[PDB]
CSV table of C-alpha atoms and ligand atoms in Angstrom, one decimal:
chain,number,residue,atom,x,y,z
A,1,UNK,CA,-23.1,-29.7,-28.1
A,2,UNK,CA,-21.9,-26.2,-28.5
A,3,UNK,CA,-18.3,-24.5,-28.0
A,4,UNK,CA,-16.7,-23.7,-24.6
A,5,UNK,CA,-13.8,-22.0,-23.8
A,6,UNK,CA,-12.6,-24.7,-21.8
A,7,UNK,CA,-14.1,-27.7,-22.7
A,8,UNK,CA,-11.9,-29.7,-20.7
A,9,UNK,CA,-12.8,-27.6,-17.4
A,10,UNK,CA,-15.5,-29.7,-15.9
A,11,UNK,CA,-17.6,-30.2,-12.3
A,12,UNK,CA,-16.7,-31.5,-9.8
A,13,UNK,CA,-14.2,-28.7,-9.9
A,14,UNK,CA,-10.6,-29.2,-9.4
A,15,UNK,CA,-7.3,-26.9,-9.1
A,16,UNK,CA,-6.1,-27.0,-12.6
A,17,UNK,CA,-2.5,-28.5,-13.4
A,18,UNK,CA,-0.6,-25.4,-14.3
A,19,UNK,CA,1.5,-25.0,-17.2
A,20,UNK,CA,4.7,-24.8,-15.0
A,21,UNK,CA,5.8,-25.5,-11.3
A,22,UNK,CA,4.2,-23.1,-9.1
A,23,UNK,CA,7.1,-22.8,-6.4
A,24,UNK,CA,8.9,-20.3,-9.2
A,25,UNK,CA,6.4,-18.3,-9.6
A,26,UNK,CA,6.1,-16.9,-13.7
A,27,UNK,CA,9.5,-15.0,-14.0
A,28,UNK,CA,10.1,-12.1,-14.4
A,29,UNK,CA,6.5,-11.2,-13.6
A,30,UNK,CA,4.9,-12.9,-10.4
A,31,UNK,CA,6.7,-13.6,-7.3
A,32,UNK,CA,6.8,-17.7,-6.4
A,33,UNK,CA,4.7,-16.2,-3.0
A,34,UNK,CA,2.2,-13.5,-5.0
A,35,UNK,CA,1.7,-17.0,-7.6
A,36,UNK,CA,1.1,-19.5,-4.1
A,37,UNK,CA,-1.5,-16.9,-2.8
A,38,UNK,CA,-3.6,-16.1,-5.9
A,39,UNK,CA,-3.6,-20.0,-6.8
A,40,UNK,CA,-3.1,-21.8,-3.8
A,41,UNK,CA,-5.1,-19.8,-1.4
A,42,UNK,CA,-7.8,-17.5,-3.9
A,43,UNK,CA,-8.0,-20.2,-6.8
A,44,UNK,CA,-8.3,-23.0,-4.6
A,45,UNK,CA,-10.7,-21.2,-2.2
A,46,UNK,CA,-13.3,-20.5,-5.4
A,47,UNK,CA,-12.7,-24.6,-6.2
A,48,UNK,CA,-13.6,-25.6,-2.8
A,49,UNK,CA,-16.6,-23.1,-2.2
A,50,UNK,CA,-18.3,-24.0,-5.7
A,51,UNK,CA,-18.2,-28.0,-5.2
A,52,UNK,CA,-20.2,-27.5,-1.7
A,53,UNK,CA,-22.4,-25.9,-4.0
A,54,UNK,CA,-22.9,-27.9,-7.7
A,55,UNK,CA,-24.6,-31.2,-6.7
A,56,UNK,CA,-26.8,-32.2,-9.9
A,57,UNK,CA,-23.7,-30.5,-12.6
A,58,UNK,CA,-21.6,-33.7,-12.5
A,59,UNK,CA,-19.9,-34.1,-16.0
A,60,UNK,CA,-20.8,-30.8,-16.6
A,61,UNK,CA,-18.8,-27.9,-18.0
A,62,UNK,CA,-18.0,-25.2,-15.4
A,63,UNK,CA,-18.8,-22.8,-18.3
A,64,UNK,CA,-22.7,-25.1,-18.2
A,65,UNK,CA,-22.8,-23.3,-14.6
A,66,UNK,CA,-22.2,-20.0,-15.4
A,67,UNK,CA,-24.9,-19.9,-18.2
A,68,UNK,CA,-27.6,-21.7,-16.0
A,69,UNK,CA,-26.6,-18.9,-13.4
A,70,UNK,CA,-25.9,-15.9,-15.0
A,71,UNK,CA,-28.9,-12.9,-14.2
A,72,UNK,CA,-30.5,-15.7,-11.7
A,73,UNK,CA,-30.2,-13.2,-8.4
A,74,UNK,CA,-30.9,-16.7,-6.0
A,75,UNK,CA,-28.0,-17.9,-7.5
A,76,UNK,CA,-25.5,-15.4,-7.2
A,77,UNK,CA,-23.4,-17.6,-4.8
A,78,UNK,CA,-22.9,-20.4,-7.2
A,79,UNK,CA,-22.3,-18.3,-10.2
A,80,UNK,CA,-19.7,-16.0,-8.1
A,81,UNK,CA,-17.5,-19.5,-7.6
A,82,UNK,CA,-18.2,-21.0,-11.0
A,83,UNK,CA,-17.3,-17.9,-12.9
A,84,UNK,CA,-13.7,-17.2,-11.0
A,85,UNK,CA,-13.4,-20.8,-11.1
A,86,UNK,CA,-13.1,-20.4,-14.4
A,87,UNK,CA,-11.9,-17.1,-15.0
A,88,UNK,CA,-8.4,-18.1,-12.7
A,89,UNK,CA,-8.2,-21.3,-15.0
A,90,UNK,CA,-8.6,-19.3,-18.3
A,91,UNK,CA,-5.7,-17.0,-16.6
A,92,UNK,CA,-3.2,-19.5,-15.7
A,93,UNK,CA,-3.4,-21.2,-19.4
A,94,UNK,CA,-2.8,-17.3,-20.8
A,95,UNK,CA,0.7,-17.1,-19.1
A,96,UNK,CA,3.7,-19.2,-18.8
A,97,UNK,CA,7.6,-18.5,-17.2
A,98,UNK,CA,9.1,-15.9,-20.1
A,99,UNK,CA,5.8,-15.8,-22.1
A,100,UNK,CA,5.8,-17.3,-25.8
A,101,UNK,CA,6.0,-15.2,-28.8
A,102,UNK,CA,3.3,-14.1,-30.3
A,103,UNK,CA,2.6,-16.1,-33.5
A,104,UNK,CA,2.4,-14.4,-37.2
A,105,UNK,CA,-1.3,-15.4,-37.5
A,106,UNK,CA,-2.2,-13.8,-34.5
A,107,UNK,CA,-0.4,-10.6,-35.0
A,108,UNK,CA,-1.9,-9.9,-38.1
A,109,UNK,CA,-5.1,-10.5,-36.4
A,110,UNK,CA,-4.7,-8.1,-33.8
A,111,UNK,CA,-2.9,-5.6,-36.0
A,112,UNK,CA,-5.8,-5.7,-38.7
A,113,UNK,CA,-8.5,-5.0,-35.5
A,114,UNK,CA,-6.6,-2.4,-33.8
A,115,UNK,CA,-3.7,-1.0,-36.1
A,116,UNK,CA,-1.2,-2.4,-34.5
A,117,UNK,CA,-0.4,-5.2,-31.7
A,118,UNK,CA,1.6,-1.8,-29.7
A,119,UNK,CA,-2.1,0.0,-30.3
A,120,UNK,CA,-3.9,-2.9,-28.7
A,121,UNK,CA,-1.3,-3.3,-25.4
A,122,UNK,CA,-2.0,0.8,-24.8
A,123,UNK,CA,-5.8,0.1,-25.5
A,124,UNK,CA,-5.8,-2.8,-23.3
A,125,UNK,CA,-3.6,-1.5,-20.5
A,126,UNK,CA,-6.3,1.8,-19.9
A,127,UNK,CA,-9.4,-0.6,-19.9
A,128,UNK,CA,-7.2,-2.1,-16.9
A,129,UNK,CA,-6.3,0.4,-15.6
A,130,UNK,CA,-9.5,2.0,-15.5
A,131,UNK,CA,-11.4,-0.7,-14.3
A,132,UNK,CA,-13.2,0.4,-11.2
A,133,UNK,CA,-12.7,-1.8,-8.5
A,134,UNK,CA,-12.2,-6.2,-8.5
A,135,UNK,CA,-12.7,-7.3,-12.4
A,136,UNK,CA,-11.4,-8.6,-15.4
A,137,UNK,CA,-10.1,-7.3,-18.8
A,138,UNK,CA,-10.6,-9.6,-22.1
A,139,UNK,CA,-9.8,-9.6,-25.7
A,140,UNK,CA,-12.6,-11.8,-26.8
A,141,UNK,CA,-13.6,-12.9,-31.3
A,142,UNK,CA,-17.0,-11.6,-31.3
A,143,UNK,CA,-18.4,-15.2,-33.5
A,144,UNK,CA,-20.9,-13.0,-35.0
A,145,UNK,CA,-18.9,-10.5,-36.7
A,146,UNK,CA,-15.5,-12.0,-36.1
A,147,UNK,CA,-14.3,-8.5,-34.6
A,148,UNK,CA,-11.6,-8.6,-31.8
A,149,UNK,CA,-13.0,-6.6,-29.0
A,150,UNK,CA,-11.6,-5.7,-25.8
A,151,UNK,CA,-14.3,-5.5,-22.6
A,152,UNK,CA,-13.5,-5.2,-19.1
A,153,UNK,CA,-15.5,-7.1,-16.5
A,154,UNK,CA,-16.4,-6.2,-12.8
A,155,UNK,CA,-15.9,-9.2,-9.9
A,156,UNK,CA,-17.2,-12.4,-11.5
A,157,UNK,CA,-18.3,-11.1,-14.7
A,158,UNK,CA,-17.0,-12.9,-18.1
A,159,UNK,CA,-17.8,-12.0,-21.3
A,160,UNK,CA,-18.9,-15.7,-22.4
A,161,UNK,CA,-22.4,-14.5,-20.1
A,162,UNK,CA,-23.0,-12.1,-24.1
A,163,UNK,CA,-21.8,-14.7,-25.9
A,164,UNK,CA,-18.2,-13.6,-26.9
A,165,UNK,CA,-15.4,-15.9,-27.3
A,166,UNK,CA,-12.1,-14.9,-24.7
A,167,UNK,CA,-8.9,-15.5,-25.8
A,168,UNK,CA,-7.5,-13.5,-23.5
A,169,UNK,CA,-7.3,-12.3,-19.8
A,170,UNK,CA,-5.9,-10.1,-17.3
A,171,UNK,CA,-7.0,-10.3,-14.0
A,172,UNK,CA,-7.5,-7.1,-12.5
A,173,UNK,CA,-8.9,-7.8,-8.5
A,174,UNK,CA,-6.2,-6.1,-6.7
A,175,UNK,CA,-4.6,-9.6,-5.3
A,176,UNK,CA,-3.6,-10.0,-8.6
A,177,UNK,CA,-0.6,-8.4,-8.6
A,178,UNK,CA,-0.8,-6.4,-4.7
A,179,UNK,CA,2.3,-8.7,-3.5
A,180,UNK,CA,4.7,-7.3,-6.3
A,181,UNK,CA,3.5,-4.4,-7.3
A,182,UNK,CA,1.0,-2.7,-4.2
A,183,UNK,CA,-0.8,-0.3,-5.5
A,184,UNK,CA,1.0,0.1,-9.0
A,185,UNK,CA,-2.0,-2.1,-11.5
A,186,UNK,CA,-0.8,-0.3,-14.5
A,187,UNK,CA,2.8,-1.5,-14.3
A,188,UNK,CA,1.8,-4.8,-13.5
A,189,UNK,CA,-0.2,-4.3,-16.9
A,190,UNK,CA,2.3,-3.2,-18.7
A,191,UNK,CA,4.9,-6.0,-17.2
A,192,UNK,CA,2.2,-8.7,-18.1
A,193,UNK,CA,2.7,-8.9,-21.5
A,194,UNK,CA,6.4,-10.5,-20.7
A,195,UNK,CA,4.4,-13.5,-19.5
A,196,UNK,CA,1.6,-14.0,-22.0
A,197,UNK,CA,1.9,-17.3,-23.5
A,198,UNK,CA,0.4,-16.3,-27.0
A,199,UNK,CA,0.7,-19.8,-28.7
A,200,UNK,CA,-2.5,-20.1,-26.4
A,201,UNK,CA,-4.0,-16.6,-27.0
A,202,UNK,CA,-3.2,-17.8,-31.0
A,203,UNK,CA,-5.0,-21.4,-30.5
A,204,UNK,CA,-8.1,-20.0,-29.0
A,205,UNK,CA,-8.2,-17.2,-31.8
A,206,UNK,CA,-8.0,-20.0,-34.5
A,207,UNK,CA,-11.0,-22.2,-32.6
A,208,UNK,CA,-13.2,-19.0,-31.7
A,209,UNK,CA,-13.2,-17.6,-35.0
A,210,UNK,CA,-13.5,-20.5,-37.1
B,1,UNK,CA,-30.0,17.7,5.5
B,2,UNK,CA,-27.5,15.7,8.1
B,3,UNK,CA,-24.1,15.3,7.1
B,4,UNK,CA,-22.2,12.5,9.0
B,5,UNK,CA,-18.8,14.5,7.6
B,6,UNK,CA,-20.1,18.3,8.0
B,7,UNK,CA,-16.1,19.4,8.0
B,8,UNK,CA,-15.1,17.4,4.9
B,9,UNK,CA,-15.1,19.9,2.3
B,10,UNK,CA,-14.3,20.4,-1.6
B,11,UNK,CA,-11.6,21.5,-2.8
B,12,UNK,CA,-10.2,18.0,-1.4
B,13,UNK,CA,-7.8,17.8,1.0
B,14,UNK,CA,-6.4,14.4,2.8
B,15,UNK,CA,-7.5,14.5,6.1
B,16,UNK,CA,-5.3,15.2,9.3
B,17,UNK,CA,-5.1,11.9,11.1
B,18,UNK,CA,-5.8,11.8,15.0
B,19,UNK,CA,-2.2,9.6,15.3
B,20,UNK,CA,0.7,9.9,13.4
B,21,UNK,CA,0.8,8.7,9.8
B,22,UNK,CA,4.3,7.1,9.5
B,23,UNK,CA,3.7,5.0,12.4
B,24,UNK,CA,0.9,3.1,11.1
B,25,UNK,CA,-1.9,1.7,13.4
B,26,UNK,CA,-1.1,-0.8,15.9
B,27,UNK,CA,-1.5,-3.1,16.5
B,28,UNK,CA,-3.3,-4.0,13.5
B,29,UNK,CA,-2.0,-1.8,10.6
B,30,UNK,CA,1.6,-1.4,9.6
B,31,UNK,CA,3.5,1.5,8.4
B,32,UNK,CA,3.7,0.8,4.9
B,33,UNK,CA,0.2,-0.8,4.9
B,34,UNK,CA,-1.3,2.5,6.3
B,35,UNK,CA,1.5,5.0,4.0
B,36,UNK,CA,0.2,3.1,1.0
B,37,UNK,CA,-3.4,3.2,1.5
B,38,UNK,CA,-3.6,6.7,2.8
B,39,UNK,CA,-0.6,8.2,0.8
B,40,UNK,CA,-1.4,6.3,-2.2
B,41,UNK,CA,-4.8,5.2,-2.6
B,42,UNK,CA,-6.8,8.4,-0.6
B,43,UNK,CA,-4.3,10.7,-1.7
B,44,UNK,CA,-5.3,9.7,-5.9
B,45,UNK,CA,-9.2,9.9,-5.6
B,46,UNK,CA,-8.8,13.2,-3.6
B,47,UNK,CA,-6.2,14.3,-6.3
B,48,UNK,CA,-8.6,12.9,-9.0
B,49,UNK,CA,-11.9,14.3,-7.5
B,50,UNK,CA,-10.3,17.9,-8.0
B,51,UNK,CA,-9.9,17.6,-11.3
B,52,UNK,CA,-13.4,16.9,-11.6
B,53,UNK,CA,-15.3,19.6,-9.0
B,54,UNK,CA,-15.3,23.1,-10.0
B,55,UNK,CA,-18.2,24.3,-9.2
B,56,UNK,CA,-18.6,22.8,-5.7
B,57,UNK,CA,-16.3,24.8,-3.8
B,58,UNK,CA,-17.2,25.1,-0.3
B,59,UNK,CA,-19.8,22.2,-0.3
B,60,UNK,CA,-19.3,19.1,1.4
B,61,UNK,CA,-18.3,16.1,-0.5
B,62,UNK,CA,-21.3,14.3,0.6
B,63,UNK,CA,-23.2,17.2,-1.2
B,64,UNK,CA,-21.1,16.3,-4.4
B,65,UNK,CA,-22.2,12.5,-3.5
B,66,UNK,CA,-25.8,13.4,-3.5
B,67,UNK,CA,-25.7,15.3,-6.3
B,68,UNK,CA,-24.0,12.9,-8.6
B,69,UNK,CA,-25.5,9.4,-7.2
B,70,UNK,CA,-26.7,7.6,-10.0
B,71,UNK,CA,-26.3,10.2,-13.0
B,72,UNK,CA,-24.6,7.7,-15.8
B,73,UNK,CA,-22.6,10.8,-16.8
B,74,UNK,CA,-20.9,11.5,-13.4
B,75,UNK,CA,-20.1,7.9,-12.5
B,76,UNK,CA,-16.3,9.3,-12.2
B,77,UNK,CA,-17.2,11.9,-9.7
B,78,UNK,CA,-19.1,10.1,-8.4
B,79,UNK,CA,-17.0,7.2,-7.1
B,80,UNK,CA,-13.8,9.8,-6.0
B,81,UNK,CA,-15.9,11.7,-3.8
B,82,UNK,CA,-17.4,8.5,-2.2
B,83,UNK,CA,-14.5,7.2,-1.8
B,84,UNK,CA,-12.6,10.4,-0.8
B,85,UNK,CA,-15.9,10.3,2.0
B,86,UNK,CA,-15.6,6.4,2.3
B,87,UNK,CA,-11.7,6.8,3.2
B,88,UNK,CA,-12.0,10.0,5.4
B,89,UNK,CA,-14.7,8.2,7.6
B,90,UNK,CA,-12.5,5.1,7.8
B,91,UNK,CA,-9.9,7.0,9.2
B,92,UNK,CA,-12.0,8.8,12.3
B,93,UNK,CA,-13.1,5.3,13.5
B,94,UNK,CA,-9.5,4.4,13.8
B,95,UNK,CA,-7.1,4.8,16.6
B,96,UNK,CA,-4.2,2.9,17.5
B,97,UNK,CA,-4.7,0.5,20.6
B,98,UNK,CA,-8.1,1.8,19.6
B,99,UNK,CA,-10.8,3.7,22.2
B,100,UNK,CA,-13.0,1.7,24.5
B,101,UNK,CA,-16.7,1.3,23.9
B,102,UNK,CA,-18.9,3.8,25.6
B,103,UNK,CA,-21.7,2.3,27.7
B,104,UNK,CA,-24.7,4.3,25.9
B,105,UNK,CA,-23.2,2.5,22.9
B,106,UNK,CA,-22.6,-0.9,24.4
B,107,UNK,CA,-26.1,-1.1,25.2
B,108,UNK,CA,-27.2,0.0,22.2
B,109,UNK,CA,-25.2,-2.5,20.2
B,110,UNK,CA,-26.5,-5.3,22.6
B,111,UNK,CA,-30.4,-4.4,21.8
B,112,UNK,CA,-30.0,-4.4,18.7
B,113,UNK,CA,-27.9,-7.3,17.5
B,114,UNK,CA,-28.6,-9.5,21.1
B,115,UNK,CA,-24.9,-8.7,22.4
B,116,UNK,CA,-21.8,-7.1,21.2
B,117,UNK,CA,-20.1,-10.3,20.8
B,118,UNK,CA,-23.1,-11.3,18.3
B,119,UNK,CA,-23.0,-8.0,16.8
B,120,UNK,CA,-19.2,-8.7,16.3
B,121,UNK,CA,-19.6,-11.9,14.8
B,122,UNK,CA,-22.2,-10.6,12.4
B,123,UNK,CA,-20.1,-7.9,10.9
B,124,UNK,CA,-17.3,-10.0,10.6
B,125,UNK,CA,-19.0,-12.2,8.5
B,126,UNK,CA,-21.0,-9.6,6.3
B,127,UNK,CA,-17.0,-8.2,5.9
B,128,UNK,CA,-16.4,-11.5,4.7
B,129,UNK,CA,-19.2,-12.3,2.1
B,130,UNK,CA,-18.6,-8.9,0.8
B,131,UNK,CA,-17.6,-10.1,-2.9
B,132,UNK,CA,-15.4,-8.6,-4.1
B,133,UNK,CA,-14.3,-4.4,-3.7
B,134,UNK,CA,-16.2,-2.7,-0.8
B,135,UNK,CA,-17.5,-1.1,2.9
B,136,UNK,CA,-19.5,-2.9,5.4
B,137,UNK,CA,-21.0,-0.2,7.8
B,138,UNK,CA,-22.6,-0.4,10.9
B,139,UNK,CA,-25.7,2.5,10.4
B,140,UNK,CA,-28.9,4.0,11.8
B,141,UNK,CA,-31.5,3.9,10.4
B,142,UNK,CA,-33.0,7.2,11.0
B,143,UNK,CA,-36.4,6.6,10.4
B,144,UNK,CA,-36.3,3.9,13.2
B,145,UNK,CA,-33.5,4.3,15.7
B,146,UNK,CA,-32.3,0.8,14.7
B,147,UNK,CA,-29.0,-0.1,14.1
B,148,UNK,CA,-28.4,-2.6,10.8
B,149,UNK,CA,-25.2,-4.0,9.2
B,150,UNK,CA,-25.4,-2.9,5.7
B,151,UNK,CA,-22.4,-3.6,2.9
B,152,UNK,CA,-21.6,-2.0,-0.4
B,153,UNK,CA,-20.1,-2.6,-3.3
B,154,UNK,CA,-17.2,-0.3,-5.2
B,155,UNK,CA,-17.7,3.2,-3.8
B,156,UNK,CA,-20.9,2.7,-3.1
B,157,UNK,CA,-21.9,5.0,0.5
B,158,UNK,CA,-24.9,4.7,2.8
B,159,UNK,CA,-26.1,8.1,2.4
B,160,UNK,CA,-27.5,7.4,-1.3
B,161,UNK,CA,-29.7,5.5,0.7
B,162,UNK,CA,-30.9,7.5,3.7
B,163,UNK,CA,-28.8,5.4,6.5
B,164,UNK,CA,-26.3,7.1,9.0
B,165,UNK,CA,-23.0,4.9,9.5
B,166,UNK,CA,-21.4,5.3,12.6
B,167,UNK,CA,-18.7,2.8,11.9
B,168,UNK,CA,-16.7,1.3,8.5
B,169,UNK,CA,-14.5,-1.2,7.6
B,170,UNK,CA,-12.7,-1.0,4.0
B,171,UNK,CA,-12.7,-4.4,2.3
B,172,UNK,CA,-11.0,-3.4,-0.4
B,173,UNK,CA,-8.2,-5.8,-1.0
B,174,UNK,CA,-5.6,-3.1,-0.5
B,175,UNK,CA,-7.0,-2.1,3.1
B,176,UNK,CA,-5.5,-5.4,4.6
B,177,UNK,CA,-3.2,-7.2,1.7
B,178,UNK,CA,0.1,-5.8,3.0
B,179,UNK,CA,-0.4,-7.1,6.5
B,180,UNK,CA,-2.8,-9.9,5.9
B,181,UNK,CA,-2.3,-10.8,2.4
B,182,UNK,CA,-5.9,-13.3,1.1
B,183,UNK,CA,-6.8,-13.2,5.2
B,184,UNK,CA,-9.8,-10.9,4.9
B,185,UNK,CA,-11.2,-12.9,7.5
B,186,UNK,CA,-8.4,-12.4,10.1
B,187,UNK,CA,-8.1,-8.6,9.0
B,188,UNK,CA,-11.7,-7.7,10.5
B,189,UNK,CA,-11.2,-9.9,13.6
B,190,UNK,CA,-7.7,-8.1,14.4
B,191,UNK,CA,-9.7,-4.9,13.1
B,192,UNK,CA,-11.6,-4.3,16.4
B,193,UNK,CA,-8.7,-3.6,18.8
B,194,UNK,CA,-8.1,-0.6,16.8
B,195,UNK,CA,-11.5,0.7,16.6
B,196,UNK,CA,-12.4,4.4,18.3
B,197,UNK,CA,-15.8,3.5,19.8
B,198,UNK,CA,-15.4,6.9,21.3
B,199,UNK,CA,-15.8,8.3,17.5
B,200,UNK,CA,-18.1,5.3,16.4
B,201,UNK,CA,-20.4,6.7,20.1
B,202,UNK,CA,-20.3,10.3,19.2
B,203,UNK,CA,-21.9,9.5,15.7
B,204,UNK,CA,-24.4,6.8,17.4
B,205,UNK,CA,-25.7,10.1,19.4
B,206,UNK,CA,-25.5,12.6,16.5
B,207,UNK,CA,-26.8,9.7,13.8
B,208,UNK,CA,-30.3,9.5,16.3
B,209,UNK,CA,-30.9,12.7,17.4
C,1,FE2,FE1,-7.7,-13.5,-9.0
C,2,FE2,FE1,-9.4,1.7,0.7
């Protein structure tokens, strides 16, 4: 009885049912084959790997795993799946084909935290950017003092572990984006941002900081 | 102290590759995977890593290495010149058609690990459960002769922790996504047939002198 990011993301895990049909990719961003390896083949391998290992967390959050993992080095493993489980999930529902547009509640928001929505993309683009190695970056509502923060995350690691709230991600592990864009992580950064579904990004704003 | 790279050097400088660097490595490496991951990914830390340096001139970048290893402050440095070092190894245990074992290190391998198939085997699969960005080395351990499979994470470089690698294999998503794309797995079984054992030998002798 306490909030979750994704409630509705639950053990035994399961591919989630994605906003859109996979086979297109998300235009104009991800390639329908750089979309069928990071979902199909990474996603799915996390999904598989993490129900081998959850007996005992039936009807359970996935978020319910990371917490009772988190810092626990003998259960590195399990937290590893359970974490990118839900990290890829909290992704997918972030982006759809041609993005939405942000709405006024949320630009205000982001505009009041950082001075403008331009000033957080640049902000969030160098945390990317400059995120050594496989990770994560987030803008999560801080529930405490309802600041919008952005943190970046190495391999598994999700802010929800310090108790901030994400309502957004971009996943920065280098098969992410190598298919389309090799190398180049901050133009897939920057190119993101066409793809951002921010009628979600605005919904989990509204829950997290109420 | 022993330096497993005494000739790699600051200022930084890409390394000369023993084959030609347009033709990639077969048959395991293509072109493009080998011009984007030397040209590209080597080619930034050892352009970043220069920025960052003055005052090391003339010392080896596993002098920088030690001297920056963790030191909060110089985490930058830090990870360009272990990867610069990192990548610059890599490249020396790499041939194309590869370089066949050397008996003094076949039977070396065999003691240690039971046979090379086993030893094989083993390193695939520490390659494998390698989460996320990283190395998996094959080392001495200097203080016993033994060889040991050790991995690391990021940049991170088995001389911060007293072992001598003789042998690497990047795991870093970009050192087999081109050509492999999620296959990790399939990337370090292919890996072998390009491996210079004849490079991996002469550190084996050097590493346990
Ligand atoms: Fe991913
Ligand atoms: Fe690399």
């Amino acid at each position: 009885l306490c909030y979750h990011t994704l409630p509705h993301l639950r053990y035994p895990a399961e591919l989630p049912t994605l906003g859109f049909n996979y086979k297109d990719g998300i235009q104009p961003v991800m390639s329908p084959r750089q979309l069928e390896l990071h979902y199909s083949k990474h996603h799915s391998a996390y999904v598989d790997k993490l129900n081998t290992l959850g007996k005992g967390y039936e009807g359970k959050t996935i978020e319910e795993i990371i917490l009772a993992t988190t810092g626990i080095n003998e259960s590195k493993v399990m937290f590893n799946q359970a974490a990118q489980h839900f990290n890829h999930s909290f992704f997918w529902k972030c982006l759809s084909p041609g993005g939405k547009p942000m709405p006024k509640t949320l630009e205000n928001a982001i505009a009041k935290q950082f001075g403008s929505v331009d000033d957080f993309m640049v902000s969030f683009q160098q945390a990317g950017v400059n995120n050594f190695g496989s990770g994560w970056t987030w803008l999560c509502v801080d529930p405490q003092t309802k600041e919008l923060l952005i943190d970046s995350t190495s391999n598994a690691g999700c802010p929800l572990t310090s108790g901030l709230r994400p309502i957004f991600t971009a996943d920065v592990w280098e098969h992410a984006y190598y298919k389309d864009f090799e190398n180049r992580r901050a133009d897939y950064l920057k190119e993101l941002w066409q793809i951002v579904d921010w009628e979600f990004v605005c919904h989990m704003y509204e829950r997290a900081t109420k």
